[PDB]
Design a protein around this ligand. Structure first.
Ligand SMILES: Nc1ncnc2c1ncn2[C@@H]1O[C@H](COP(=O)(O)OP(=O)(O)O)[C@@H](O)[C@H]1O
Ligand SMILES: [Mg+2]
Lengths: 83, 460, 173, 113
């Protein structure tokens, strides 16, 4: 039922209204010791500056699959998940 | 068409995923647009289903996950031939001298196997050099490997510039200079020196400096060999100068852990001996043609026991160990006559008078060394007369090993001296036989032949 | 590779489907789970770092046409361990396990052209005597074989191509 | 609101709902048996889990206990009140005298001048 079952899935996914992140955006998923992990952010170059909430920036140093490692330039105790 | 996508970029190491058919094989090249910059990747591992892990031959900055990669189905291939003479190139064989295209007729892959055991050719055609200590203690044949071992600042470069002057100008054959991990200033100073002396038309130069990402410093040594091996297969006699074998191994160390390898004894890669072997077994003189090579070898921390210098000692025909002590004492060149040797130092192949002189010199200096701490604590008065004699002759011998170089004139303000091999033997034999026992030690310091030792003695 | 993490769940499912006489239903259920796990949006939900409980609800709700014992648990427990990318491997593991218990071998034959159906039936009965299983031949028409046949029987193979013999003779020279 | 999920020696992991996870240096409170234990957050892991350090004895904690999320750092009395007295890391009085009569309390994680 492969074509029918995969349509059934596509419609139920859309109807649940789960949705992709935009390219050039992501979310912080872990904050620890001045290093953050961001999910998403597909169009991030290595060494790029990513704007945090606030005027704070982080440098993207590590481009894993399914994660980004960035380093925070300043005080970091203000950040959280979901940003 | 493009066929792969980048899936990881951790530091200098890039992973690319391809369809599970037609995955690139090991040591292949790949190409990606790093913005406007064409970036080459070299494949190092086939790991997992369809993925290959690779090293960037350029800066890794500016890469995104999901960039398209195109697989060139060959290794890195470089220009080889006469068109390479007089030109500076990078690891990829691209001109960095701004004189235009290379104009090559042929291009060759930098990864190739070494000569078969039955191809190797025996030689004892001893080269003569102006340097007294080397020609006495470590003479070397055409077609042999020479290694200059030292820590930082002991004279490796000044020695290699002197040997390039003395050997290469008499040599009518083409030469290659491989600047592995060289300082950019020293590379420019060399290029201008050759350009002024008009010997640049018979040297090909490959430069991979310190600032370049690890893949360049890793692979630039193999581009040097690939050019020299083209000249050898044409049948020429070639001179190959390699600025540091050490920073090939170090360029391997930096990237090894990111390639997933478990660390070895002193943090080196597990493959240090194979990586050294595969490179150094290509540098050989075959039946078709001869490569003669001089290599400088950095000695980390000045310990000859560190795995990297320790393994390379087993590949070389002559090993000139420089020492920091002798340099700190101000004796130049700082060659240690007790540690340095050659396999051409045989009574059969040198003159038997040469061999006898060398054995005498080494025996005397060894006998001085053990006396040193005895004199330091208990004092010179508690030697005997025959030891007071041999300690004097030892000091005279240890001065007559010093020499002014034409390329080490800028540092010291004195002319440069070239001594013929025969004059060297004649002098050291005369000193040991005591024909000059009455002359002061400074009558031997920084002089040419022993006739110049008696002229300066007269002035003294 | 996920084969190793698939193995505990594939064995638990296969050990369980025979306790409840529904191997045939479980197989298509897992083939379902393997097809949905390939979807490009579902893989983004899988990579999206929800907490396992709310992610589990966000997967169980989307795959509701599954039994309480079967769907809602296997998908949740693999989701807590983050193993759901193992599902295409859990499927093949499950199939193999079945073919093992049912004493079957999915023998493959390869040839330059079709066989006479007497040749092929002889091949079946002979492989069933070589092995100790009910074989299930499937043929392939590969023109490089030129003549003869290859029989592949899982990890074991039997080369009868002329090309293999030609290149063997080229090395006997 | 949150629950203890791991107790590894001195560190304690607490799981919170997705929308009210404590900030990187906030303090939490647990009833460890008959005693109240303060925890200080150190790391926000993913999925609303935080790693915390226990400001007291970690024995007796059981997984599944319920923590209480205070919305401020460790804040200690300061000034003329804290002048003849012995105090604890939490700024509690440790001499057997009564309470410290402070007008003001400062958080202990501040910035250098
Ligand atoms: N033969 C020499 N005469 C005068 N100075 C020398 C001589 N050899 C070495 N030196 C001094 O020691 C320095 C360090 O040696 P050099 O060859 O330049 O670097 P390295 O030895 O590390 O390759 C030289 O730059 C020079 O200052
Ligand atoms: Mg040097």
């Amino acid at each position: 039922n492969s074509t029918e079952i995969s349509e059934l899935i596509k419609q139920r996914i859309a109807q649940f209204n789960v949705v992709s992140e935009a390219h050039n955006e992501g979310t912080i998923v872990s904050v620890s010791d001045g290093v953050i992990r961001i999910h998403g952010l597909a169009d991030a170059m290595q060494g790029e500056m990513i704007s945090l909430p606030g005027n704070r920036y982080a440098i993207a140093l590590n481009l894993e699959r399914d994660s980004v490692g960035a380093v925070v330039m300043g005080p970091y105790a203000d950040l959280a998940e979901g940003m | 068409m493009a066929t792969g996508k980048i899936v990881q970029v951790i530091g200098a190491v890039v992973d690319v995923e391809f369809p599970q058919d037609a995955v690139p094989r090991v040591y292949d090249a790949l190409e990606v647009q790093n913005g406007n910059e064409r970036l080459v990747l070299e494949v190092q591992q086939q790991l997992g289903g369809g993925i290959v892990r690779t090293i960037a031959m350029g800066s890794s900055d500016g890469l995104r996950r999901g960039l398209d990669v195109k697989d060139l189905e060959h290794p890195i291939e470089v220009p080889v031939g006469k068109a390479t003479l007089g030109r500076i190139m990078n690891v990829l064989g691209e001109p960095v001298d701004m004189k235009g295209e290379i104009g090559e007729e042929e291009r060759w892959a930098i990864h190739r196997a070494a000569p078969s055991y039955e191809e190797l050719s025996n030689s004892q055609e001893l080269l003569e050099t102006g340097i007294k200590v080397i020609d006495l203690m470590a003479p070397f044949a055409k077609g042999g490997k020479v290694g200059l071992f030292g820590g930082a600042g002991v004279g490796k470069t000044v020695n290699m510039m002197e040997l390039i002057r003395n050997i290469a100008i008499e040599h009518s054959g083409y030469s290659v200079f491989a600047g592995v991990g060289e300082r950019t200033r020293e590379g420019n100073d060399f290029y201008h020196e050759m350009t002024d002396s008009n010997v640049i038309d018979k040297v090909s130069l490959v430069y991979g400096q310190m600032n370049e990402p690890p893949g360049n410093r890793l692979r630039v040594a193999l581009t040097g060999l690939t050019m020299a091996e083209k000249f050898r297969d044409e049948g020429r006699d070639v001179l190959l100068f390699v600025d540091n074998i050490y920073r090939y191994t170090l360029a391997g160390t930096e990237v090894s852990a990111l390639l997933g390898r478990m660390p070895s004894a002193v943090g080196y890669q597990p493959t240090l001996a194979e990586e050294m072997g595969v490179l150094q077994e290509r540098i050989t003189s075959t039946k078709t043609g001869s490569i003669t090579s001089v290599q400088a070898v950095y000695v980390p921390a000045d310990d000859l026991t560190d795995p990297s210098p320790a393994t390379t000692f087993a590949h070389l025909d002559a090993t000139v160990v420089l020492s920091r002590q002798i340099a700190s004492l101000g004796i130049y060149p700082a060659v240690d006559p007790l540690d340095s040797t050659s396999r051409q130092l045989d009574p059969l192949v040198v003159g038997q008078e040469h061999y006898d002189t060398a054995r005498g010199v080494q025996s005397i200096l060894q006998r001085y060394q053990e006396l040193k701490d005895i004199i330091a604590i208990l004092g010179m008065d508690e030697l005997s007369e025959e030891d007071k004699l041999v300690v004097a002759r030892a000091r005279k011998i240890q001065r007559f090993l010093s020499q002014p170089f034409f390329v080490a004139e800028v540092f010291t303000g004195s002319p440069g001296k070239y001594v013929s091999l025969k004059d060297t033997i004649r002098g050291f034999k005369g000193i040991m036989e005591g024909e000059y026992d009455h002359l002061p030690e400074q009558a031997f310091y920084m002089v040419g032949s022993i006739e110049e030792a008696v002229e300066k003695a007269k002035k003294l | 590779e996920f084969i190793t993490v698939a193995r505990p769940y594939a064995k638990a499912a296969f050990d369980f489907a025979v306790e409840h006489q529904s191997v045939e239903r479980w197989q298509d259920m897992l083939a379902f789970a393997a097809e949905v796990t390939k979807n490009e949006q579902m893989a983004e939900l899988l990579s999206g770092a929800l907490a396992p409980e709310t992610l589990a609800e966000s997967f169980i709700a989307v795959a509701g046409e599954q039994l309480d014992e079967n769907g809602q648990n296997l998908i949740r427990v693999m989701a807590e361990n983050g193993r759901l990318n193992a599902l295409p491997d859990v499927l093949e593991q499950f199939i193999h396990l079945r073919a093992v218990s049912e004493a079957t071998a999915e023998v493959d034959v390869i040839s330059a052209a079709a066989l006479s159906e007497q040749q092929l039936a002889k091949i079946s009965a002979a492989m069933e005597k070589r092995l100790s299983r009910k074989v299930k031949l499937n043929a392939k028409i590969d023109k490089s074989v030129m003549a003869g046949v290859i029989i592949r029987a899982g990890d074991m193979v039997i080369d009868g191509s002329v090309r293999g013999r030609l290149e063997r003779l080229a090395d006997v020279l």
